[PDB]
Design an enzyme around this catalytic site. Structure first.
Site, short mmCIF file in Angstrom:
data_model
loop_
_atom_site.label_atom_id
_atom_site.label_comp_id
_atom_site.label_asym_id
_atom_site.label_seq_id
_atom_site.Cartn_x
_atom_site.Cartn_y
_atom_site.Cartn_z
N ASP A 39 -19.94 -4.54 -22.65
CA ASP A 39 -20.91 -3.47 -22.60
C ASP A 39 -20.30 -2.16 -22.23
O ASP A 39 -20.02 -1.91 -21.06
CB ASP A 39 -22.04 -3.70 -21.67
N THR A 40 -20.07 -1.36 -23.25
CA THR A 40 -19.35 -0.06 -23.08
C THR A 40 -20.18 0.93 -22.25
O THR A 40 -19.62 1.87 -21.69
CB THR A 40 -19.03 0.58 -24.40
N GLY A 41 -21.47 0.70 -22.14
CA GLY A 41 -22.27 1.64 -21.42
C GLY A 41 -22.48 1.20 -19.94
O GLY A 41 -23.07 1.94 -19.15
C1 LIG Z 1 -31.70 -7.38 -25.55
O1 LIG Z 1 -32.12 -6.50 -24.49
C2 LIG Z 1 -31.34 -5.36 -24.43
O2 LIG Z 1 -30.48 -5.08 -25.30
N1 LIG Z 1 -31.56 -4.53 -23.44
C3 LIG Z 1 -30.75 -3.34 -23.10
C4 LIG Z 1 -30.01 -3.67 -21.76
O3 LIG Z 1 -30.51 -3.49 -20.64
N2 LIG Z 1 -28.81 -4.29 -21.95
N3 LIG Z 1 -28.17 -4.79 -20.92
C5 LIG Z 1 -26.82 -4.27 -20.86
C6 LIG Z 1 -26.67 -3.12 -19.85
C7 LIG Z 1 -27.41 -1.82 -20.25
C8 LIG Z 1 -26.99 -0.71 -19.28
O4 LIG Z 1 -25.58 -0.54 -19.47
C9 LIG Z 1 -27.80 0.62 -19.68
C10 LIG Z 1 -27.55 1.68 -18.70
C11 LIG Z 1 -26.36 2.44 -18.79
C12 LIG Z 1 -26.15 3.44 -17.80
C13 LIG Z 1 -27.09 3.73 -16.79
C14 LIG Z 1 -28.28 2.97 -16.77
C15 LIG Z 1 -28.49 1.98 -17.70
C16 LIG Z 1 -26.82 4.79 -15.83
C17 LIG Z 1 -27.14 4.60 -14.47
C18 LIG Z 1 -26.51 3.73 -13.57
C19 LIG Z 1 -25.43 2.85 -13.88
N4 LIG Z 1 -26.03 1.54 -14.25
C20 LIG Z 1 -25.44 0.60 -15.10
O5 LIG Z 1 -24.32 0.93 -15.49
C21 LIG Z 1 -26.10 -0.65 -15.51
C22 LIG Z 1 -25.51 -1.88 -14.85
C23 LIG Z 1 -24.05 -2.14 -15.32
C24 LIG Z 1 -25.43 -1.59 -13.30
C25 LIG Z 1 -26.36 -3.08 -15.12
N5 LIG Z 1 -26.03 -0.68 -17.01
C26 LIG Z 1 -27.10 -0.98 -17.87
O6 LIG Z 1 -28.16 -1.24 -17.29
C27 LIG Z 1 -28.08 -6.27 -21.06
C28 LIG Z 1 -29.34 -6.93 -21.02
C29 LIG Z 1 -29.73 -7.72 -22.08
C30 LIG Z 1 -30.95 -8.41 -22.04
C31 LIG Z 1 -31.82 -8.23 -20.98
BR1 LIG Z 1 -33.64 -9.18 -20.86
C32 LIG Z 1 -31.45 -7.40 -19.95
C33 LIG Z 1 -30.19 -6.75 -19.92
C34 LIG Z 1 -31.60 -2.06 -23.14
C35 LIG Z 1 -32.90 -2.16 -22.25
C36 LIG Z 1 -30.75 -0.80 -22.75
C37 LIG Z 1 -31.96 -1.91 -24.59
#
Ligand SMILES: COC(=O)N[C@H](C(=O)NN(CCC[C@@]1(O)Cc2ccc(cc2)C/C=C\CNC(=O)[C@H](C(C)(C)C)NC1=O)Cc1ccc(Br)cc1)C(C)(C)C
Ligand SMILES: [Cl-]
Ligand SMILES: [Cl-]
Ligand SMILES: [Cl-]
Lengths: 99, 99
Positions: free
Chosen positions: B25-27
């Site tokens: 997860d690059t983000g």
């Molecule tokens: C299939 O469901 C998804 O693809 N969900 C995504 C998602 O949350 N993907 N997650 C990957 C992480 C997305 C994100 O990188 C977005 C994201 C990126 C960056 C920020 C917030 C959110 C900025 C703020 C704070 C830093 N937070 C983060 O980096 C957090 C952390 C690593 C702490 C979990 N990062 C993230 O929340 C994995 C996931 C998959 C299924 C479920 Br049910 C739940 C989660 C989205 C809601 C963004 C569309």
């Protein structure tokens, strides 16, 4: 471009004629942007993130430019911590992961 | 390798003697895994994503192997809906986004 990951992969996007910053997120199936106005009708979607589920507005077939690359696809609008570009539009601009 | 984004970019990790599947997860700032035991010292942390925050345990200097590439870094353990490999370990294996 080739983007390393020592910092957040924040890029400039253009949507509805406005510039915004957004995060290129390969862990995201979908693209979700903070509250904004878009044209047309929307459909409901419940999406799940690390903290639980949110309700968003789904707009389809929206033009959006990502780092100057043109895409047209689904954009979800709702209460997200940051604008996230997910795989639905990453694939449109020919993005891959390499190591 | 070159990893396509038409599907979720899931890989096998080895960590704490266990094999697990996780999403590149690059983000993501951090790496976060579902509940599991790890050795050594830890401190609690709140981490936020879509839907709000969850409380996790933070373990530092943990060895991990990701598609055959060894790295070491911080691993967060808690009630995440899915295992995520974030940028703190993706940098160490030389993972870049390209388009
Ligand atoms: C299939 O469901 C998804 O693809 N969900 C995504 C998602 O949350 N993907 N997650 C990957 C992480 C997305 C994100 O990188 C977005 C994201 C990126 C960056 C920020 C917030 C959110 C900025 C703020 C704070 C830093 N937070 C983060 O980096 C957090 C952390 C690593 C702490 C979990 N990062 C993230 O929340 C994995 C996931 C998959 C299924 C479920 Br049910 C739940 C989660 C989205 C809601 C963004 C569309
Ligand atoms: Cl789409
Ligand atoms: Cl780290
Ligand atoms: Cl590098």
């Amino acid at each position: 471009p080739q983007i390393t990951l020592w910092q957040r992969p924040l890029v400039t996007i253009k949507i509805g004629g406005q510039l915004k910053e957004a995060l290129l997120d390969t862990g995201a199936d979908d693209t979700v942007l903070e509250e904004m106005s878009l044209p047309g009708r929307w459909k409901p979607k419940m999406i799940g993130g690390i903290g639980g589920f949110i309700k968003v507005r789904q707009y389809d077939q929206i033009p959006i430019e990502i780092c100057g690359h043109k895409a047209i696809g689904t954009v979800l609008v709702g209460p997200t911590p940051t604008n996230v570009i997910g795989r639905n539009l990453l694939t449109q601009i020919g993005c891959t992961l390499n190591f």
